[PDB]
Design an enzyme around this catalytic site. Structure first.
Site, mmCIF file in Angstrom:
data_model
loop_
_atom_site.group_PDB
_atom_site.id
_atom_site.type_symbol
_atom_site.label_atom_id
_atom_site.label_comp_id
_atom_site.label_asym_id
_atom_site.label_seq_id
_atom_site.Cartn_x
_atom_site.Cartn_y
_atom_site.Cartn_z
ATOM 1 N N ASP A 1 49.928 89.614 -11.865
ATOM 2 C CA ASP A 1 50.945 88.933 -11.080
ATOM 3 C C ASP A 1 52.334 89.239 -11.624
ATOM 4 O O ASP A 1 52.611 89.105 -12.828
ATOM 5 C CB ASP A 1 50.688 87.411 -11.052
ATOM 6 C CG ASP A 1 51.234 86.755 -9.813
ATOM 7 O OD1 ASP A 1 52.422 87.003 -9.487
ATOM 8 O OD2 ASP A 1 50.461 86.024 -9.105
ATOM 9 N N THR B 1 53.158 86.162 -3.834
ATOM 10 C CA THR B 1 51.780 86.341 -4.310
ATOM 11 C C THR B 1 50.678 86.307 -3.248
ATOM 12 O O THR B 1 49.881 87.269 -3.160
ATOM 13 C CB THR B 1 51.490 85.306 -5.428
ATOM 14 O OG1 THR B 1 52.335 85.613 -6.558
ATOM 15 C CG2 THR B 1 50.011 85.391 -5.903
ATOM 16 N N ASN C 1 53.743 81.817 0.820
ATOM 17 C CA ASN C 1 52.953 80.927 -0.060
ATOM 18 C C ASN C 1 52.878 79.523 0.521
ATOM 19 O O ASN C 1 52.094 78.693 0.060
ATOM 20 C CB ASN C 1 53.545 80.832 -1.479
ATOM 21 C CG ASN C 1 53.300 82.064 -2.286
ATOM 22 O OD1 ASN C 1 52.412 82.881 -1.956
ATOM 23 N ND2 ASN C 1 54.064 82.222 -3.367
HETATM 24 O O1 LIG Z 1 42.481 84.462 -9.064
HETATM 25 C C1 LIG Z 1 43.296 84.635 -8.195
HETATM 26 C C2 LIG Z 1 43.100 85.764 -7.210
HETATM 27 C C3 LIG Z 1 42.609 86.958 -7.713
HETATM 28 C C4 LIG Z 1 42.691 88.156 -6.828
HETATM 29 C C5 LIG Z 1 42.475 89.425 -7.357
HETATM 30 C C6 LIG Z 1 42.563 90.522 -6.523
HETATM 31 C C7 LIG Z 1 42.848 90.333 -5.138
HETATM 32 O O2 LIG Z 1 42.948 91.389 -4.248
HETATM 33 C C8 LIG Z 1 42.555 92.607 -4.645
HETATM 34 F F1 LIG Z 1 41.453 92.426 -5.337
HETATM 35 F F2 LIG Z 1 42.346 93.305 -3.554
HETATM 36 F F3 LIG Z 1 43.456 93.143 -5.489
HETATM 37 C C9 LIG Z 1 43.038 89.053 -4.626
HETATM 38 C C10 LIG Z 1 42.966 87.954 -5.457
HETATM 39 N N1 LIG Z 1 44.463 83.792 -8.091
HETATM 40 C C11 LIG Z 1 44.561 82.783 -9.125
HETATM 41 C C12 LIG Z 1 44.972 81.428 -8.712
HETATM 42 C C13 LIG Z 1 46.258 81.189 -7.880
HETATM 43 C C14 LIG Z 1 47.459 80.876 -8.759
HETATM 44 N N2 LIG Z 1 48.640 81.222 -7.916
HETATM 45 C C15 LIG Z 1 49.963 80.587 -7.871
HETATM 46 O O3 LIG Z 1 49.957 79.329 -7.812
HETATM 47 N N3 LIG Z 1 51.240 81.299 -7.875
HETATM 48 C C16 LIG Z 1 51.410 82.199 -8.967
HETATM 49 C C17 LIG Z 1 52.498 83.074 -9.036
HETATM 50 C C18 LIG Z 1 53.795 82.586 -8.384
HETATM 51 N N4 LIG Z 1 55.070 83.046 -8.382
HETATM 52 N N5 LIG Z 1 55.855 82.187 -7.547
HETATM 53 N N6 LIG Z 1 54.996 81.165 -7.017
HETATM 54 C C19 LIG Z 1 53.752 81.390 -7.508
HETATM 55 C C20 LIG Z 1 52.385 80.697 -7.337
HETATM 56 C C21 LIG Z 1 48.161 81.794 -6.672
HETATM 57 C C22 LIG Z 1 46.702 82.085 -6.794
HETATM 58 C C23 LIG Z 1 46.679 83.629 -6.938
HETATM 59 C C24 LIG Z 1 45.292 84.183 -6.986
HETATM 60 ZN ZN LIG Z 2 52.544 87.019 -7.569
#
Ligand SMILES: O=C(/C=C/c1ccc(OC(F)(F)F)cc1)N1CC[C@@H]2CN(C(=O)N3CCc4[nH]nnc4C3)C[C@@H]2CC1
Ligand SMILES: [Zn+2]
Ligand SMILES: *[C@@H]1O[C@H](CO)[C@@H](O[C@@H]2O[C@H](CO)[C@@H](O[C@@H]3O[C@H](CO[C@H]4O[C@H](CO[C@H]5O[C@H](CO)[C@@H](O)[C@H](O)[C@@H]5O)[C@@H](O)[C@H](O[C@H]5O[C@H](CO)[C@@H](O)[C@H](O)[C@@H]5O[C@H]5O[C@H](CO)[C@@H](O)[C@H](O)[C@@H]5O)[C@@H]4O)[C@@H](O)[C@H](O[C@H]4O[C@H](CO)[C@@H](O)[C@H](O)[C@@H]4O[C@H]4O[C@H](CO)[C@@H](O)[C@H](O)[C@@H]4O)[C@@H]3O)[C@H](O)[C@H]2NC(C)=O)[C@H](O)[C@H]1NC(C)=O
Ligand SMILES: [Ca+2]
Length: 803
Positions: A121, A159, A180
């Site tokens: 991220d 994100t 978001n």
């Molecule tokens: O475990 C995952 C997901 C893993 C994943 C991996 C590959 C993917 O696609 C692929 F595989 F194709 F690549 C798709 C998903 N998460 C963790 C939990 C939350 C925390 N977060 C926030 O709450 N934010 C974090 C950062 C941020 N910056 N500004 N607001 C925010 C809120 C959002 C959410 C993001 C996704």
């Molecule tokens: Zn992000």
């Protein structure tokens, strides 16, 4: 309700999801408050840490440990990742010289190289170079594998939209996750960061990679991880899954890291405190690759290291307040931050008007740090309009700024030094891509590309058939050693007519005049050849565009240009011409200023007429091939043909004239000749797709002449600019734009000044991919080059960014 009485005994990080009200043991039960009572004890062990030390070597297995150093641990698939290095004299993966992986080297029972997506991220592209001293594992991946200098995220550079785009190959407007935070008016429901609504299936459109895999018999690890699960435990869980028996073992996996986004928000993108988050990520990469090595998978697995978006410097004191602009501040709902979306706060308020909101927001302050748009007027390259969850009024916020509704929203809610979300062409928003493994190329640098392309490639890596998506399948073949997908050009649907001279001047009643009655086998045989296409190799350099839908059109040839003229839309679909570096600009002669000429190849019933433009007080006309670039006084008359004419608002003619009079010559000078293809676009329903005849919302008054929403140009030359554009032996170079055709220049705050101060900046904002124009027109360009089709697909996805 959870009956948490059940047990996680023998089920830690189970792969199927057991339905309520039985308790869960998966990587997301914490997020649901649904874990079994014993989840922490059994599944989240921590005793003794994450590394073997000398004295744990061949210890007696102690199940209470987080990971093990006992002799049976390779059998059980649960050694600490550094086990072999400490206890068995092996070295870390990063300390090994890298060696090309020419063929997969997989253990028996592996049907295909597994895929591991390692997502980070907020990993800004420039961290690769700027932090490379503290990231040796990531630097080995990058330098030994395949890498881009950067990868382009989707807008908004938040994100949820970007991770779901990575997973589906879709624009946010098609997958549904347009921010978001969202309001769906049909559902009458809100999607938020905190809460349980975001889990409801109806928000998530398209078909993400884990669903694609599953439906085609390829098993997936679970992609999402609860924040409280430590990175080490995520790595060991993946490694454990990789030792499951063949029939149960997933083939695709994801890891996710909250860093460096989390720290980048507090410290800014380059704060001194950012070094540690980057060391920590590297260490995790190191644990993974060490773990793969012990499993003998380090030359079998394809690993993708990929970010969702970058991070920019943004603080509280850079906030613009809508309350400094609007009198009716409390009548609106603003979704705030690095983008703005506006709707009426109440649906029962009919004293709400977008037009007055926009006008109060438009060039109101000298230094204004956001620009308002109706969503359909946003640059087409953002593809951010075709979804009911996207509010009609949008604010593009300048890099380094926020927009908020009232000052009380900021100080009663500085806390932060970084944010993201801005225009996806912004440099600080760019992210990373590295691919390493048997299927990726060895030590290969590829040009920057967009993250919508990746889903196709991950499908290829796993032998899957991609769901229909916004990627261009084939455009990333140059990333791959093998598993290439070999696309074929689409078939042309409509074949053109080639009209000859069929009509006498006096059959035309177009209300047009031209002072052209001034007139030899020398220069008449010559000009008959031109009308039959004798100079077409000069002006039509890459074949005729293919029309990919059913319609009736004529090819028309001229000395200086060639066109495909639509008898349906009464104007060309495309006009092609080449401007050499030697070519000279001329003016329109005084006697020819109002000149329009009937085209005796095209019937009066299929022509425009000047009467309509006379009576339409709002609408004027321009020409697609510009008379300024005509090659001879005699050739100029071709430029005034009624079949080269298009409807243009006066305000837009300022833009178009400067482009044709000044900028084409300047591009030809700089690029050693250019080929130009220009034309109209009709996208009244703002879906990024060509409109059919019966979807046209605006005609030149009292006529059947349809009014384009946009005009495009594609400007091609030789990538090796020592070669002229018309005699190019190798790769090509391209830039394009899709200019909105609007009745004012309100978008350009400096527009009362001279075109030389504002027109090129507008055009740069509306830069486009040839592929974007293809969707908007139903045309297929570059049909006849000597380049490979894969190379052509890449050219067509290229975006010239000017950053
Ligand atoms: O475990 C995952 C997901 C893993 C994943 C991996 C590959 C993917 O696609 C692929 F595989 F194709 F690549 C798709 C998903 N998460 C963790 C939990 C939350 C925390 N977060 C926030 O709450 N934010 C974090 C950062 C941020 N910056 N500004 N607001 C925010 C809120 C959002 C959410 C993001 C996704
Ligand atoms: Zn992000
Ligand atoms: C980027 O790539 C994407 C994907 O290629 C492109 O988006 C696609 O573009 C198509 C043309 O716009 C569009 O076709 C529609 O489909 C309508 C039915 O579609 C529903 O089912 C879809 C299939 O899902 C399944 O997938 C596989 C098979 O592939 C199955 O095995 C699974 O079981 C899956 O379920 C589904 O994708 C789609 O979901 C959308 O809507 C949901 C909300 O209800 C969202 O959750 C989801 O995110 C999708 O939302 C997006 O797309 C919709 C439009 O579909 C849009 O409204 C949203 O804003 C958002 O952008 C559906 O659930 C079908 O009804 C359409 O046919 C109508 O028009 C034709 C014209 O030819 C008529 O002949 C026909 O009769 C019908 O008209 C009738 O209805 C009219 C309007 O209401 C009415 O006026 C008329 O009188 C008639 O009664 C049409 O074929 C794809 O659906 C769309 N796909 C996606 C994923 O978005 C996109 O264009 C690319 N972008 C660019 C710029 O290139
Ligand atoms: Ca359309």
């Amino acid at each position: 309700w959870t009956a948490t009485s059940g047990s996680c005994k023998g089920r830690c990080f189970e792969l199927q999801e057991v339905g309520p009200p039985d308790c869960r043991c998966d990587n997301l039960c914490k997020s649901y408050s649904s874990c079994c009572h014993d989840f922490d004890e059994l599944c989240l062990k921590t005793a003794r840490g994450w590394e073997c030390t000398k004295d744990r070597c061949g210890e007696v297995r102690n199940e209470e440990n987080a990971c093990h150093c006992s002799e049976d641990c390779l059998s059980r698939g649960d050694c600490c990742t550094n086990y072999q290095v400490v206890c068995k004299g092996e070295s870390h993966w990063v300390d090994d010289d890298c060696e090309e992986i020419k063929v997969p080297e997989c253990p028996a029972g592996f049907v295909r190289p597994p895929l591991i997506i390692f997502s980070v991220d907020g990993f800004r592209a420039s961290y690769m170079k700027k932090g490379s001293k503290v990231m040796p594992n990531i630097e080995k991946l990058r330098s030994c594998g395949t890498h881009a200098p950067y990868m382009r995220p989707v807008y908004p550079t938040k994100t949820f939209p970007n991770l779901y785009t990575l997973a589906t190959g879709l624009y946010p407007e098609s997958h549904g996750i347009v921010g978001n935070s969202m309001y769906d008016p049909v559902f009458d429901a809100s999607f938020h960061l905190r809460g349980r609504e975001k889990f409801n299936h109806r928000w998530w459109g398209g078909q993400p990679l884990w669903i694609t895999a599953t439906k085609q018999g390829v098993r997936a690890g679970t992609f999402f991880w609860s924040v409280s699960i430590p990175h080490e435990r995520r790595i060991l869980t993946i490694l454990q899954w990789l030792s499951l028996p063949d029939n149960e073992r997933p083939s695709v996996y994801a890891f996710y890291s909250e860093q460096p986004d989390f720290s980048g928000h507090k410290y800014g993108p380059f704060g001194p405190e950012m070094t540690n988050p980057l060391r920590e990520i590297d260490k995790t990469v190191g644990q993974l690759m060490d773990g793969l090595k012990q499993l003998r998978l380090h030359r079998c697995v394809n690993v993708i290291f990929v970010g969702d978006h970058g991070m920019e410097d943004v603080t509280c004191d850079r906030t613009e307040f809508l309350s400094n602009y609007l009198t009716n501040v409390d009548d609106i709902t603003l979704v705030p931050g690095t983008l703005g979306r506006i709707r009426a706060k109440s649906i029962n308020n009919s004293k709400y008007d977008p037009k007055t909101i926009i006008a109060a927001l438009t060039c109101k302050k000298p230094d204004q740090h956001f620009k308002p748009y109706m969503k359909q007027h946003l640059p087409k390259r953002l593809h951010y309009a075709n979804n009911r969850r996207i509010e009609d009024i949008h604010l593009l916020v300048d890099r380094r700024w926020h927009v908020a509704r009232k000052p009380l929203d900021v100080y009663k809610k500085c806390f932060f030094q970084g944010d993201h979300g801005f225009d996806n062409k912004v440099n600080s928003m760019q992210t990373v891509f590295v691919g390493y493994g048997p299927t990726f190329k060895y030590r290969t640098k590829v040009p920057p590309f967009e993250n919508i392309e990746l889903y196709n490639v991950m499908c290829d890596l796993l032998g899957l058939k991609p769901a229909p998506n916004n990627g261009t399948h084939g455009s990333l073949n140059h990333l791959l050693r093998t598993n290439t997908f070999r696309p074929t050009m689409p078939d042309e649907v409509s074949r053109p007519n080639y009209p000859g001279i069929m009509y006498l001047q006096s059959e035309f009643d177009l209300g047009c005049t031209c002072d052209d009655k001034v007139e030899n086998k020398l220069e008449e045989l010559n000009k008959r050849l031109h009308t039959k296409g004798s100079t077409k190799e000069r002006h039509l350099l890459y074949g005729r565009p293919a029309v990919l839908y059913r319609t009736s059109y004529d090819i028309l040839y001229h000395t200086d240009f060639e066109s495909g003229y639509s008898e349906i839309f009464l104007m060309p679909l495309w006009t092609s011409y080449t401007i050499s570096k030697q070519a000279e600009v001329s003016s329109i002669p005084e006697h020819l200023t109002n000149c329009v000429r009937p085209d005796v190849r095209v019937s009066p019933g299929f022509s425009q007429n000047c009467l309509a433009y006379k009576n339409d007080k709002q609408m004027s006309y321009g020409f697609l091939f510009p008379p300024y670039l005509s090659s001879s006084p005699e050739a100029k008359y071709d430029a005034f043909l009624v079949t080269n004419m298009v409807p243009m608002y006066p305000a837009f003619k300022r833009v178009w004239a400067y482009f044709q009079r000044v900028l084409v010559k300047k591009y030809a000078s700089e690029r050693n000749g250019v080929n130009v293809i220009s034309g109209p676009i009709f996208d009244y329903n703002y879906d990024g797709l060509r409109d059919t005849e019966d979807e046209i919302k605006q005609y030149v008054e009292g006529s059947s002449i349809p009014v384009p929403t946009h005009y495009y140009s594609i400007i091609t030359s030789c990538l090796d600019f020592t070669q002229p554009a018309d005699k190019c032996d190798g790769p090509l170079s391209v830039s394009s734009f899709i200019l909105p055709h609007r009745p004012d220049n309100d978008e350009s705050c400096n527009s009362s000044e001279d075109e030389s101060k504002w027109v090129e900046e507008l055009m740069k904002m509306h830069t486009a991919r040839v592929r974007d124009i293809e969707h908007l027109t139903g045309l297929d360009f570059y049909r006849k080059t000597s380049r490979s089709y894969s190379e052509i697909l890449t050219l067509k996805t290229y975006l010239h960014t000017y950053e």
